[PDB]
Amino acid sequence: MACRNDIHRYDATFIAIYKSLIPAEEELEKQRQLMAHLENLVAKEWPHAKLYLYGSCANSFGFPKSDIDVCLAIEGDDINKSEMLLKLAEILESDNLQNVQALTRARVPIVKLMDPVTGISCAICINNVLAVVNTKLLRDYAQIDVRLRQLAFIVKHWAKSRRVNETYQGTLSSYAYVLMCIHFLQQRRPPILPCLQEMEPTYSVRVDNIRCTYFDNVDRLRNFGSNNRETIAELVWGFFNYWAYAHDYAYNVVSVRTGSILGKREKDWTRRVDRHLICIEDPFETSHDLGRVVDKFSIRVLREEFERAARIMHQDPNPCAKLLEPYIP
RNA sequence: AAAU
């Protein structure tokens, strides 16, 4: 199947959606205000702690009204994150922050809050420093070619509109969608993005026993994708066509780390151990399949939505608006 | 089953 030959009639509609999702500078100032407020609070409780922003508010892919993610980093070998987060939830409530919720039995313990002063909502985790590093990797990829943020914005907005963007309900995180978008652009001919982890590296850090190494001098690559002249509507059609009809769900793994497709058997992801129904390898924690949140029920919904998206992109006379229509049972 |  070849891309529809009228595809460029729809580029402008997708650019307009992308531009509509860029956060307002006023919202970014409110993020900084809440971060400084939280830094002050934590400094009285744990003066030796340090706070780091990560996730959508720091990786270039944030939407308007996106929560800020904060990593509370603290040294020690006997750190009990649940006891810390329960103490922090009480400190947050006593400072008059709202909707403070501590989930200390989840896989990654977390406390959530909403600030009525800045209107910004926030989630805090303890010592998940790896997330700060993969945030930098995504931020560095985003500097290489504007089409990455454009495609990722359309895909993330689509996933929210079609209700397939919540790991608690068995669908995919925004971080997973951004990795899928990076991998798709790595595989274009010619490629729109390089494989930074395969290049001669300029950056390397170790967190826990995991070394994170890649070429991060991305200012040298600002025109890397210039040999590829594909437009945004072409890439949106191609992305959903891949996941709808080309991806081998039973056997294949998409790997931003290598810019290639790996085998499930080669990854030892052949059966649930951690389900492995739509395999997306984390670039640094390579034992982590980001699709493991998807189960034997939600995989059917995801694939059905991929097929709907691909067919809309190929055949609908107004594909941008139709693609993003909400699902109404 | 809840972070990135």
Numbering used by the authors: 425 to 697, 700 to 755
Provide excerpts from the study:
RNA uridylation is catalyzed by a class of template-independent terminal ribonucleotide transferases (TENTs) or terminal uridylyl transferases (TUTases). In Arabidopsis, HEN1 SUPPRESSOR1 (HESO1) and URT1 (UTP:RNA uridylyltransferase) act cooperatively on unmethylated miRNA uridylation to trigger their degradation. In addition, URT1 uridylates a subset of mRNAs with short poly(A) tails and is negatively involved in post-transcriptional gene silencing. It consists of two canonical globular domains, the catalytic domain and the central domain, separated by a large catalytic groove where RNA substrate usually binds.
To further explore the URT1-mRNA recognition, we co-crystalized the URT1 (410–764) with a 5′-AAAU-3′ RNA stretch and obtained their complex structure at 1.8 Å resolution. In this structure, RNA bound URT1 in a canonical way with 3′-U sitting in the UTP binding site (+1 position) of URT1, and three other adenines sequentially occupied the 0, –1 and –2 RNA-binding positions along the catalytic groove. Unexpectedly, different from our and other previous researches in which the structures of apo- and RNA-bound forms of TUTases are basically the same, URT1 experienced a large conformational rearrangement upon the RNA binding, with its entire catalytic domain rotated by ∼30° from its original position in apo-form (open state) toward to the central domain, about the joint region of these two domains, to form a more compact structure (closed state). In the URT1–AAAU complex, the 0 nucleotide-binding position was occupied by an adenine (A0) representing the 3′ extremity of the mRNA poly(A) tail. Among the URT1 residues surrounding A0, N552 provided the specific contact with the adenine by forming a hydrogen bond between its side-chain group and purine N3, while V532 made a hydrophobic interaction against the base. Unlike the +1 and 0 nucleotide-binding sites, URT1 possesses a group of less conserved residues for RNA recognition at the –1 position, where the protein–RNA interactions are dominated by hydrophobic stacking. The adenine at this site (A–1) was perfectly sandwiched by the side-chain groups of Y592 from the central domain and L527 from the catalytic domain. At the –1 position, we noticed that both the side-chains of L527 and Y592 stacked exactly with the pyrimidine ring of A–1 but not its imidazole ring. Clearly, our results showed that both A2U and A2C are weakly tailed by URT1 whereas A2G is properly tailed in a pattern very similar to poly(A) but with somewhat lower efficiency. These results are consistent with our above speculation and suggest a conclusion that L527 and Y592 help URT1 to establish a preference for purine over pyrimidine at the –1 nucleotide-binding position. More strikingly, the R531 from the SSL loop largely re-orientated its side chain with the end group of side chain shifted by 16.9 Å to form a 2.6 Å hydrogen-bonding interaction (salt bridge) with D700 from the central domain.
